[PDB]
Amino acid sequence: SVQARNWARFDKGHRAVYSKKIPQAYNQATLPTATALVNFQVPMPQSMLPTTPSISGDLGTNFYNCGHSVLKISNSSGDYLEVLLIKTTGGGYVFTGKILKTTYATGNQPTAITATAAHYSMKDLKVAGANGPNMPLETIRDIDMASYVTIGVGAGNGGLVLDINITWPSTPPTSYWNIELEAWDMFGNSEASI
Amino acid sequence: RNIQKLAWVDKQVHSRGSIKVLFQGDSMTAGYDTTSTDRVPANNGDWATHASMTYPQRFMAYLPEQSGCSVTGVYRAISGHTAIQSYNEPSWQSNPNCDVVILMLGLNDAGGVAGTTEDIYMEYMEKLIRRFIDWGMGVVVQTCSTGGQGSGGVVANLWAKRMRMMADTYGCAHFNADEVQYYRHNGAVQSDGGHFNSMGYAIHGQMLASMFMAGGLLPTYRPLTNEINTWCGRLDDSIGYCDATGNINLGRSDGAYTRTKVVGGMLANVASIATFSFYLDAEAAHIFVHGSGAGPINVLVDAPSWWNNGAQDYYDFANNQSINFSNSPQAANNAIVDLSTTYSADRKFVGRILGRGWKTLTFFTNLQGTGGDFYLNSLTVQPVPVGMSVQARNWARFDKGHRAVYSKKIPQAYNQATLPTATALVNFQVPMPQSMLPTTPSISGDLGTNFYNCGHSVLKISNSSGDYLEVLLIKTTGGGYVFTGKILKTTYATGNQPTAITATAAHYSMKDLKVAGANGPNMPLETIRDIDMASYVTIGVGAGNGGLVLDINITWPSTPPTSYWNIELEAWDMFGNSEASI
Amino acid sequence: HFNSMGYAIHGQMLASMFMAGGLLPTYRPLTNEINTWCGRLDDSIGYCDATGNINLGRSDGAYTRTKVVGGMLANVASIATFSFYLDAEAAHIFVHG
Amino acid sequence: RNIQKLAWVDKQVHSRGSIKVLFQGDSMTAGYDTTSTDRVPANNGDWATHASMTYPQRFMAYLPEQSGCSVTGVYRAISGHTAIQSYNEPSWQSNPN
């Protein structure tokens, strides 16, 4: 149990891991083509959120009000990439991704890994009255996984996400990627909560 | 009398019997729909146009399908009717000769229809309950099922809650009808502000039948709160098992992958339906199965999977969803059991069920009788956080899970009265983690060839000498079941680093702790079996029913170092997952 | 015997049982995570609109799929209370507000 | 009758109604406090000094605040009293309504 987040005490939590496979391994009747990992959106973890932004300030300026998350990337080629997503600069909502451990050579290591805090936009699955008079009665809405807006640029009600941008020195390697975002979280926390 | 009749009805539901059901209520019971074009002309004694499927109609088509209990219904529902009107209806003064009455009134009573007050509503609902009991019918009282997910019918539902508590005096079973659309899209299930469409009424009837099969009629029923491993024929106060077709083989065999040895089986070339019904007391639950067989096994978990006339496109969006939009896209029903003979002994991740309410898990083979066999050895329903719920493994979405760690000490530190000797770590067997399993091997291929169908696990090894070894266990080659162990971080020197670390996927063999009749005639009655931790067979070489394991082989360049090792296998897993499930 | 604070605690817990629906025989203590909103009716969490001005209106501006925006209007004193029996030693409280 | 009245009371609690509450019991119900200085002189038909806030007093100040249901209470609590004494109390033989 956490009394106050990022308070004067050590908050005992677990290691919440956000796992995704690029390309997906579910129901692939044929072998998917190897893809380049240059951009993906992972939900913003709890440790990265500001504590009392109205009082202690937001991550835009007070870049200490956030914590860190570890981005562990591995591919079917055996290449591993451990990235420390931490905010070193203010003035924006960009987390500096420092590579901790990588099996890539220095000329093959990604040049810059950027984690940008953002909110998903909301989209209408079925606008009210789309099928006819009062069908549906109300608009059926969903989060737009393709539309996300950087914090400060605009407001989105789809949830806090990280726009992870991986910049490669040469053409991006293509493989079957395993993406894990490791960060501290409250035990069994469903959503990162400010 | 009401309790005895409800007990008889429950036994009929769980014994493939027959029940005559009285559907008494207002427009919501009648299936009122005057807004959409998915209507049928006024029937069943009502004046108002009805949706193409009403809740009683779906109940009568659904309960026999999922439980085998034949259901015949009598309609006593008129749109706009109140408790006072229902009690004094000239055509409803006769006994309909039913077994159970499902009574839902109060939406019109709260509106003051027929001069109805709260006291009048209470008195006449009590009178209706007494009259129904006097007619030999068990009474199931419903709260006012309305639209808006709590935004409407507030007074009606307050009166309904008071009526439900009053009906507790008469031992009446209850169905919280107001929460049947709580985790759904309102637009997908409503025709107007307070009335459902065909799909909404279908959902209501299906949840009512789910309460019937779950044992919710019984006063000893308890909603499912924690992970449960249930099998065919298991009797619990939380999960109600129904053999709808009456042909599920509750035979005991050592070929089962469970310790209960119940092999509950759907024979080939016959249509078998096994359904598990329960109230999920959580926002989500992961569904796991220990099942094997050759012919297609079909699992239906949520509403649009059982009935959908396709009258509206949006009827498909009427499955249970997460309440919050944040990082939770529209949920589609995905309940698949992968019948790969490679992983037949292994647990299969069926999918997730969303929402708090009455759930039915329908396991059925080919309904036309042209399919093969399936053995439903055990079913696991594990309530999970809704953000941790996985719809489909390794799908187009980011699945939020935790970091499951398999920890072992070589040598063990437990009950070591003397200091154990330092041992060399060259070979150990760790259970195969979830991230390393193939996704839909029957469709997307197994790890033997499609070496992408697996994920990676990190093997973190540390010893009492301070030497650390972080190994990425990942499959880089096909043609076998060998995972290439790439050393990520090690405190060893380059000449001291292990030359090759190999993780081989394998199954434990099963061994007999006590063969049947070992101690004498019929002692023990049955063979007591266990997994053989010393005997494991590589996948493809042979079949083992002891569980998916990794045969970790560490090759050292020189004589293997001897120390006190701490072995941790880090990998992604579903929150609280007990077993890696394909 | 309690002091003033102990008796205050006892009375407050008694009122909590009253508002939670603990008088009802169908009440169940809260055992797992629940996402409840204003106006939601559960056998575990009892919602009370103390001031009677919590807006149970439906709007797409809500951050939940239930669209209940249960709202405390500006310049008016609004009190929304949720009462339940916590069947655990601790619980994390989260709000979408 | 008890179940019907409890249902009515629950609806009043959850509907901003009004309930008249009888607080019957021993020193713990009366709010006995003869040890601390946080006391008030013996009131509510009891002989013993009471704490500055008793459980019934906090209940009557708390339930209307958190649920909107007005609460008026009748005190039938005397310190040191038992069930036999409470049943045969000369002043408690009348209906407190």
Residue numbers in the entry:
A (entry chain A): 584 to 777
B (entry chain A): 196 to 777
C (entry chain A): 390 to 486
D (entry chain A): 196 to 292
What do the authors of the reporting publication say about this deposited model?
We isolated and characterized two Shigella podophages that have notably different features when compared with classical podophages and instead are most closely related to phage N4. We describe the isolation and characterization of phages Moo19 and B2, including whole-genome sequencing and analysis, cryo–electron microscopy (cryo-EM) structure determination, mass spectrometry, host range studies, and enzymatic assays of the tail proteins. Our work shows that these phages have divergent decoration proteins and unique tail structures, and encode and package their own phage-dependent RNA polymerase, and the tails, which display esterase activity, are dependent on specific O-antigen modifications of lipopolysaccharide (LPS) for entry. Moo19 and B2 are similar to bacteriophage N4—these are all T = 9 podophages, which encapsidate their own polymerases—a hallmark of this phage family.
Because we could not resolve the highly flexible side tailspikes in either Moo19 or B2 virions, we purified these components to examine them separately. Genome analysis and mass spectrometry data indicated that the tailspike was a single protein in Moo19 (gp82) and a complex of two proteins in B2 (gp48/gp49). We used a similar approach as described by Subramanian et al. and purified gp82 alone. We also copurified a complex of gp48/gp49 as previously described. Using cryo-EM, we solved the structure of the isolated tailspikes to 2.4- and 2.3-Å resolution, respectively. The tailspikes most closely resemble that of the tailspike in phage G7C and differ wildly from the tailspikes in DEV, which more closely resemble a myophage fiber. Each structure is a homotrimer, with individual ribbons colored cyan, green, and magenta. Therefore, we tested the purified Moo19 tailspike gp82 and the complex tailspike from B2, gp49/49, for esterase activity using a colorimetric assay. Positive esterase activity would result in a visibly yellow color and increased absorbance with time. Both tailspikes exhibited a rapid, dose-dependent color change, indicating esterase activity. In G7C, this appendage is hypothesized to expand the host range; however, Moo19 and B2 have the same host range, so the function of gp81 in Moo19 is unclear at this time. Three major structural differences (see cartoon representation in Fig. 3B) include (i) the lack of the tail appendage, (ii) a single tailspike for Moo19 and a complex of two proteins for B2 (see next two paragraphs), and (iii) the completely different decoration proteins.
